[PDB]
Amino acid sequence: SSPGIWQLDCTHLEGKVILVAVHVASGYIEAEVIPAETGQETAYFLLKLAGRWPVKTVHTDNGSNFTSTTVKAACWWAGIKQEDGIPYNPQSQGVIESMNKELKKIIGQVRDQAEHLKTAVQMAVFIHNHKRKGYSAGERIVDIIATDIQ
Amino acid sequence: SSPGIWQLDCTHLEGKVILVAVHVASGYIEAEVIPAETGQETAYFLLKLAGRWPVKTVHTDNGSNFTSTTVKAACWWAGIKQEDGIPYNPQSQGVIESMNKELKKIIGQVRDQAEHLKTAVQMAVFIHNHKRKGYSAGERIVDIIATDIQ
Numbered sequence: 001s002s003p004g005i006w007q008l009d010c011t012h013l014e015g016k017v018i019l020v021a022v023h024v025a026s027g028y029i030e031a032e033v034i035p036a037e038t039g040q041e042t043a044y045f046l047l048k049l050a051g052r053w054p055v056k057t058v059h060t061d062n063g064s065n066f067t068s069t070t071v072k073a074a075c076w077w078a079g080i081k082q083e084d085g086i087p088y089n090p091q092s093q094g095v096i097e098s099m100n101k102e103l104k105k106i107i108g109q110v111r112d113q114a115e116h117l118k119t120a121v122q123m124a125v126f127i128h129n130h131k132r133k134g135y136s137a138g139e140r141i142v143d144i145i146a147t148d149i150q
Numbered sequence: 151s152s153p154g155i156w157q158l159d160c161t162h163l164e165g166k167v168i169l170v171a172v173h174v175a176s177g178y179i180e181a182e183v184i185p186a187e188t189g190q191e192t193a194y195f196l197l198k199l200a201g202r203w204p205v206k207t208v209h210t211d212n213g214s215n216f217t218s219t220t221v222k223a224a225c226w227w228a229g230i231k232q233e234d235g236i237p238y239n240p241q242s243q244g245v246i247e248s249m250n251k252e253l254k255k256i257i258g259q260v261r262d263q264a265e266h267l268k269t270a271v272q273m274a275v276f277i278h279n280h281k282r283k284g285y286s287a288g289e290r291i292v293d294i295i296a297t298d299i300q
Protein backbone atom coordinates (compact mmCIF):
# COMPACT_ATOMS: atom_id res chain seq x y z
CA SER A 1 0.00 0.00 0.00
CA SER A 2 1.52 3.41 -0.46
CA PRO A 3 2.73 3.35 3.18
CA GLY A 4 4.27 -0.11 2.61
CA ILE A 5 6.02 0.53 -0.73
CA TRP A 6 9.79 0.56 -0.84
CA GLN A 7 12.28 0.83 -3.66
CA LEU A 8 15.69 -0.78 -3.67
CA ASP A 9 18.47 1.24 -5.13
CA CYS A 10 22.09 0.29 -5.59
CA THR A 11 24.83 2.88 -6.05
CA HIS A 12 28.63 2.68 -6.09
CA LEU A 13 31.39 4.53 -4.30
CA GLU A 14 35.08 3.86 -3.60
CA GLY A 15 34.92 0.53 -5.44
CA LYS A 16 32.09 -0.47 -3.13
CA VAL A 17 28.37 -0.95 -3.21
CA ILE A 18 25.85 1.11 -1.28
CA LEU A 19 22.51 -0.60 -1.09
CA VAL A 20 19.62 1.74 -0.38
CA ALA A 21 15.95 1.15 0.34
CA VAL A 22 13.76 4.20 -0.13
CA HIS A 23 10.31 4.49 1.35
CA VAL A 24 8.69 5.89 -1.77
CA ALA A 25 5.93 8.02 -0.24
CA SER A 26 8.28 9.73 2.27
CA GLY A 27 11.82 9.61 0.86
CA TYR A 28 13.04 7.98 4.08
CA ILE A 29 15.97 5.66 3.47
CA GLU A 30 17.97 2.88 5.02
CA ALA A 31 21.32 1.99 3.55
CA GLU A 32 24.28 -0.32 3.91
CA VAL A 33 27.73 -0.71 2.42
CA ILE A 34 28.30 -4.19 1.01
CA PRO A 35 31.30 -5.65 -0.86
CA ALA A 36 29.13 -6.55 -3.85
CA GLU A 37 25.44 -6.67 -4.63
CA THR A 38 24.59 -10.32 -4.34
CA GLY A 39 21.23 -11.98 -3.88
CA GLN A 40 22.39 -12.93 -0.39
CA GLU A 41 23.35 -9.37 0.56
CA THR A 42 20.08 -8.02 -0.83
CA ALA A 43 18.09 -10.72 0.94
CA TYR A 44 19.74 -10.00 4.27
CA PHE A 45 19.24 -6.26 3.79
CA LEU A 46 15.54 -6.77 2.99
CA LEU A 47 15.08 -8.95 6.04
CA LYS A 48 16.58 -6.20 8.22
CA LEU A 49 14.41 -3.55 6.62
CA ALA A 50 11.18 -5.52 6.89
CA GLY A 51 11.89 -6.29 10.55
CA ARG A 52 12.14 -2.55 11.18
CA TRP A 53 9.38 -1.05 9.00
CA PRO A 54 6.13 -2.45 7.57
CA VAL A 55 7.44 -3.41 4.14
CA LYS A 56 4.52 -4.58 2.02
CA THR A 57 6.06 -4.16 -1.39
CA VAL A 58 9.62 -3.91 -2.61
CA HIS A 59 10.46 -2.67 -6.05
CA THR A 60 13.75 -4.42 -6.63
CA ASP A 61 16.63 -2.41 -8.08
CA ASN A 62 17.47 -4.77 -10.95
CA GLY A 63 16.47 -8.00 -12.61
CA SER A 64 19.13 -10.07 -10.88
CA ASN A 65 17.70 -9.24 -7.47
CA PHE A 66 14.21 -9.69 -8.90
CA THR A 67 15.27 -13.09 -10.18
CA SER A 68 17.42 -14.17 -7.26
CA THR A 69 15.88 -17.12 -5.44
CA THR A 70 17.61 -15.93 -2.25
CA VAL A 71 15.92 -12.56 -2.62
CA LYS A 72 12.57 -14.28 -3.33
CA ALA A 73 13.13 -16.45 -0.25
CA ALA A 74 13.70 -13.34 1.89
CA CYS A 75 10.63 -11.62 0.43
CA TRP A 76 8.62 -14.75 1.05
CA TRP A 77 10.06 -14.97 4.58
CA ALA A 78 9.40 -11.34 5.41
CA GLY A 79 5.94 -11.22 3.81
CA ILE A 80 7.12 -8.85 1.07
CA LYS A 81 5.54 -8.56 -2.37
CA GLN A 82 8.60 -8.57 -4.57
CA GLU A 83 7.98 -6.42 -7.60
CA ASP A 84 10.07 -5.17 -10.48
CA GLY A 85 11.38 -1.61 -10.36
CA ILE A 86 10.32 -0.73 -13.87
CA PRO A 87 9.85 3.02 -13.75
CA TYR A 88 6.43 2.94 -15.45
CA ASN A 89 6.41 6.41 -13.96
CA PRO A 90 9.56 7.99 -15.50
CA GLN A 91 9.92 10.46 -12.58
CA SER A 92 11.05 7.47 -10.46
CA GLN A 93 14.45 7.28 -12.22
CA GLY A 94 15.19 10.97 -11.85
CA VAL A 95 14.13 10.88 -8.21
CA ILE A 96 16.40 7.89 -7.56
CA GLU A 97 19.37 9.26 -9.50
CA SER A 98 19.02 12.61 -7.68
CA MET A 99 18.92 10.87 -4.31
CA ASN A 100 22.08 8.94 -5.22
CA LYS A 101 23.78 12.20 -6.14
CA GLU A 102 22.61 13.79 -2.86
CA LEU A 103 23.74 10.76 -0.84
CA LYS A 104 27.18 10.80 -2.46
CA LYS A 105 27.39 14.55 -1.80
CA ILE A 106 26.62 14.01 1.89
CA ILE A 107 29.04 11.09 2.11
CA GLY A 108 31.75 13.38 0.68
CA GLN A 109 30.79 16.09 3.19
CA VAL A 110 31.31 13.64 6.11
CA ARG A 111 33.90 11.33 4.58
CA ASP A 112 36.86 12.75 6.54
CA GLN A 113 35.04 12.49 9.91
CA ALA A 114 35.24 8.71 9.75
CA GLU A 115 37.89 6.19 8.79
CA HIS A 116 35.40 3.87 7.08
CA LEU A 117 32.93 4.31 4.24
CA LYS A 118 30.17 2.43 6.05
CA THR A 119 30.26 4.99 8.88
CA ALA A 120 30.08 7.84 6.36
CA VAL A 121 27.12 6.15 4.63
CA GLN A 122 25.23 5.92 7.95
CA MET A 123 26.04 9.54 8.68
CA ALA A 124 24.53 10.27 5.29
CA VAL A 125 21.46 8.20 6.11
CA PHE A 126 21.09 10.22 9.30
CA ILE A 127 21.47 13.52 7.54
CA HIS A 128 19.11 12.54 4.73
CA ASN A 129 16.34 11.31 7.04
CA HIS A 130 16.56 14.28 9.41
CA LYS A 131 16.83 16.92 6.68
CA ARG A 132 13.89 19.35 6.73
CA LYS A 133 12.68 20.20 3.19
CA GLY A 134 9.28 21.80 6.96
CA TYR A 135 8.96 18.08 7.71
CA SER A 136 11.72 15.48 7.50
CA ALA A 137 11.60 12.14 5.67
CA GLY A 138 11.75 10.54 9.14
CA GLU A 139 8.71 12.49 10.26
CA ARG A 140 6.92 11.79 6.99
CA ILE A 141 7.37 8.01 7.08
CA VAL A 142 6.10 7.84 10.68
CA ASP A 143 3.14 10.12 9.88
CA ILE A 144 2.26 8.19 6.73
CA ILE A 145 2.44 4.84 8.48
CA ALA A 146 0.60 6.19 11.54
CA THR A 147 -2.23 7.60 9.44
CA ASP A 148 -2.47 4.22 7.71
CA ILE A 149 -2.53 2.29 11.02
CA GLN A 150 -5.35 4.57 12.26
CA SER B 151 11.28 12.45 25.67
CA SER B 152 9.36 9.23 26.19
CA PRO B 153 9.11 8.83 22.37
CA GLY B 154 12.88 9.43 22.01
CA ILE B 155 14.14 7.15 24.80
CA TRP B 156 16.07 4.04 23.89
CA GLN B 157 17.87 1.44 25.96
CA LEU B 158 20.94 -0.45 24.83
CA ASP B 159 21.10 -4.07 25.75
CA CYS B 160 23.84 -6.56 25.08
CA THR B 161 23.25 -10.30 25.16
CA HIS B 162 25.37 -13.30 24.15
CA LEU B 163 24.79 -16.34 21.97
CA GLU B 164 27.03 -18.87 20.21
CA GLY B 165 30.17 -17.15 21.51
CA LYS B 166 28.90 -13.95 19.94
CA VAL B 167 27.42 -10.65 20.95
CA ILE B 168 23.93 -9.46 20.09
CA LEU B 169 23.58 -5.74 20.54
CA VAL B 170 20.01 -4.58 20.98
CA ALA B 171 18.41 -1.17 21.20
CA VAL B 172 14.94 -1.15 22.70
CA HIS B 173 12.53 1.72 22.25
CA VAL B 174 11.40 1.81 25.86
CA ALA B 175 7.84 3.10 25.45
CA SER B 176 6.98 0.60 22.68
CA GLY B 177 9.26 -2.44 23.05
CA TYR B 178 10.34 -2.06 19.43
CA ILE B 179 13.89 -3.24 18.87
CA GLU B 180 16.77 -3.09 16.46
CA ALA B 181 19.60 -5.54 16.82
CA GLU B 182 22.90 -6.63 15.36
CA VAL B 183 25.38 -9.45 15.78
CA ILE B 184 28.91 -8.18 16.47
CA PRO B 185 32.13 -10.08 17.25
CA ALA B 186 32.56 -8.25 20.55
CA GLU B 187 30.98 -5.27 22.24
CA THR B 188 33.45 -2.49 21.65
CA GLY B 189 32.97 1.25 21.89
CA GLN B 190 33.40 1.35 18.13
CA GLU B 191 30.73 -1.30 17.47
CA THR B 192 28.32 0.42 19.87
CA ALA B 193 29.04 3.82 18.34
CA TYR B 194 28.40 2.55 14.83
CA PHE B 195 25.22 0.79 15.96
CA LEU B 196 23.96 3.97 17.65
CA LEU B 197 24.70 6.01 14.55
CA LYS B 198 22.62 3.56 12.46
CA LEU B 199 19.78 3.64 14.96
CA ALA B 200 19.68 7.42 15.27
CA GLY B 201 19.68 7.80 11.49
CA ARG B 202 16.58 5.61 11.37
CA TRP B 203 14.54 6.70 14.41
CA PRO B 204 14.40 9.93 16.44
CA VAL B 205 16.78 8.90 19.21
CA LYS B 206 16.81 11.63 21.86
CA THR B 207 18.17 9.63 24.74
CA VAL B 208 20.13 6.39 24.97
CA HIS B 209 20.45 4.53 28.22
CA THR B 210 23.72 2.74 27.63
CA ASP B 211 23.93 -0.95 28.52
CA ASN B 212 27.05 -0.74 30.68
CA GLY B 213 29.63 1.64 32.06
CA SER B 214 32.22 0.87 29.40
CA ASN B 215 29.90 2.08 26.66
CA PHE B 216 28.87 4.97 28.90
CA THR B 217 32.54 5.82 29.36
CA SER B 218 33.72 5.08 25.83
CA THR B 219 34.87 8.26 24.09
CA THR B 220 33.92 6.65 20.76
CA VAL B 221 30.39 6.09 22.05
CA LYS B 222 30.28 9.67 23.39
CA ALA B 223 31.52 10.88 19.98
CA ALA B 224 28.71 9.00 18.23
CA CYS B 225 26.12 10.33 20.70
CA TRP B 226 27.48 13.80 20.19
CA TRP B 227 27.45 13.27 16.41
CA ALA B 228 23.91 11.90 16.33
CA GLY B 229 22.48 14.43 18.82
CA ILE B 230 21.88 11.74 21.44
CA LYS B 231 21.80 12.39 25.16
CA GLN B 232 23.92 9.56 26.45
CA GLU B 233 22.65 8.41 29.81
CA ASP B 234 23.48 5.59 32.17
CA GLY B 235 21.20 2.54 32.22
CA ILE B 236 20.90 2.39 35.97
CA PRO B 237 17.58 0.69 36.56
CA TYR B 238 16.36 3.25 39.11
CA ASN B 239 13.10 1.55 38.22
CA PRO B 240 13.86 -2.14 39.04
CA GLN B 241 11.24 -3.37 36.53
CA SER B 242 13.66 -2.28 33.76
CA GLN B 243 16.05 -5.20 34.46
CA GLY B 244 13.32 -7.83 34.45
CA VAL B 245 11.85 -6.36 31.27
CA ILE B 246 15.29 -6.43 29.59
CA GLU B 247 16.19 -9.92 30.84
CA SER B 248 12.79 -11.22 29.69
CA MET B 249 13.26 -9.69 26.26
CA ASN B 250 16.69 -11.32 25.99
CA LYS B 251 15.15 -14.66 26.90
CA GLU B 252 12.36 -14.12 24.32
CA LEU B 253 14.87 -13.06 21.64
CA LYS B 254 17.02 -16.12 22.27
CA LYS B 255 13.90 -18.28 22.12
CA ILE B 256 12.94 -16.82 18.74
CA ILE B 257 16.51 -17.14 17.45
CA GLY B 258 16.39 -20.84 18.42
CA GLN B 259 13.01 -21.19 16.68
CA VAL B 260 14.49 -19.83 13.40
CA ARG B 261 18.11 -20.89 13.83
CA ASP B 262 17.91 -23.82 11.38
CA GLN B 263 16.30 -21.69 8.62
CA ALA B 264 19.54 -19.77 8.17
CA GLU B 265 23.18 -20.69 8.04
CA HIS B 266 24.31 -17.60 9.97
CA LEU B 267 23.45 -16.23 13.40
CA LYS B 268 23.09 -12.66 12.14
CA THR B 269 20.28 -13.76 9.78
CA ALA B 270 18.55 -15.57 12.64
CA VAL B 271 18.89 -12.45 14.83
CA GLN B 272 17.22 -10.30 12.15
CA MET B 273 14.48 -12.88 11.78
CA ALA B 274 14.02 -12.52 15.53
CA VAL B 275 13.92 -8.75 15.27
CA PHE B 276 11.23 -9.11 12.61
CA ILE B 277 9.20 -11.54 14.66
CA HIS B 278 9.55 -9.47 17.84
CA ASN B 279 8.53 -6.18 16.21
CA HIS B 280 5.57 -7.66 14.32
CA LYS B 281 4.28 -9.77 17.24
CA ARG B 282 0.77 -8.74 18.32
CA LYS B 283 0.16 -8.70 22.09
CA GLY B 284 -3.63 -6.32 19.79
CA TYR B 285 -0.96 -3.86 18.59
CA SER B 286 2.63 -4.67 17.63
CA ALA B 287 5.79 -2.98 18.90
CA GLY B 288 6.23 -1.71 15.32
CA GLU B 289 2.77 -0.15 15.38
CA ARG B 290 3.33 1.23 18.87
CA ILE B 291 6.61 2.99 18.10
CA VAL B 292 5.13 4.64 15.00
CA ASP B 293 1.99 5.69 16.90
CA ILE B 294 3.96 7.03 19.83
CA ILE B 295 6.30 9.00 17.61
CA ALA B 296 3.45 10.18 15.38
CA THR B 297 1.44 11.43 18.35
CA ASP B 298 4.56 13.26 19.53
CA ILE B 299 5.22 14.84 16.11
CA GLN B 300 1.63 16.13 16.20
Ligand SMILES: O=C(O)CC[C@@H]1COc2c(ccc(/C=C3\c4ccccc4C[C@@H]3O)c2C(=O)O)O1
Nearest residue numbers: 113114115116119190191193194197223224227
Ligand atom coordinates in the same frame (compact mmCIF):
# COMPACT_ATOMS: atom_id res chain seq x y z
O1 LIG C 1 32.67 -3.10 12.91
C1 LIG C 1 31.71 -2.54 12.31
O2 LIG C 1 30.53 -2.93 12.08
C2 LIG C 1 32.03 -1.17 11.78
C3 LIG C 1 32.70 -0.56 12.97
C4 LIG C 1 32.82 0.93 12.73
C5 LIG C 1 34.19 1.25 12.20
O3 LIG C 1 34.12 2.57 11.69
C6 LIG C 1 33.83 3.34 12.80
C7 LIG C 1 33.14 2.85 13.88
C8 LIG C 1 32.87 3.65 14.96
C9 LIG C 1 33.29 4.95 14.95
C10 LIG C 1 33.98 5.45 13.88
C11 LIG C 1 34.39 6.84 14.00
C12 LIG C 1 33.54 7.83 14.27
C13 LIG C 1 32.10 7.76 14.42
C14 LIG C 1 31.27 6.66 14.45
C15 LIG C 1 29.92 6.88 14.61
C16 LIG C 1 29.41 8.16 14.73
C17 LIG C 1 30.26 9.24 14.70
C18 LIG C 1 31.60 9.02 14.55
C19 LIG C 1 32.66 10.06 14.49
C20 LIG C 1 33.94 9.25 14.44
O4 LIG C 1 34.74 9.64 13.34
C21 LIG C 1 34.26 4.65 12.79
C22 LIG C 1 35.00 5.12 11.61
O5 LIG C 1 36.08 5.74 11.83
O6 LIG C 1 34.50 4.86 10.49
O7 LIG C 1 32.67 1.56 13.98
Ligand SMILES: O=C(O)CC[C@@H]1COc2c(ccc(/C=C3\c4ccccc4C[C@@H]3O)c2C(=O)O)O1
Nearest residue numbers: 040041043044047073074077263264265266269
Ligand atom coordinates in the same frame (compact mmCIF):
# COMPACT_ATOMS: atom_id res chain seq x y z
O1 LIG D 1 27.10 -10.84 4.28
C1 LIG D 1 26.27 -10.07 4.84
O2 LIG D 1 26.40 -8.89 5.28
C2 LIG D 1 24.88 -10.64 5.01
C3 LIG D 1 25.12 -12.12 4.89
C4 LIG D 1 23.80 -12.84 5.08
C5 LIG D 1 24.03 -13.96 6.08
O3 LIG D 1 23.76 -15.28 5.61
C6 LIG D 1 22.64 -15.27 4.80
C7 LIG D 1 22.47 -14.25 3.89
C8 LIG D 1 21.37 -14.23 3.07
C9 LIG D 1 20.45 -15.24 3.16
C10 LIG D 1 20.61 -16.26 4.07
C11 LIG D 1 19.59 -17.29 4.06
C12 LIG D 1 18.27 -17.14 4.16
C13 LIG D 1 17.49 -15.95 4.41
C14 LIG D 1 17.88 -14.65 4.52
C15 LIG D 1 16.92 -13.69 4.76
C16 LIG D 1 15.59 -14.05 4.89
C17 LIG D 1 15.21 -15.36 4.78
C18 LIG D 1 16.18 -16.30 4.54
C19 LIG D 1 15.95 -17.76 4.39
C20 LIG D 1 17.33 -18.30 4.08
O4 LIG D 1 17.71 -19.28 5.02
C21 LIG D 1 21.72 -16.29 4.89
C22 LIG D 1 21.93 -17.37 5.87
O5 LIG D 1 21.96 -18.55 5.45
O6 LIG D 1 22.07 -17.01 7.08
O7 LIG D 1 23.39 -13.24 3.78
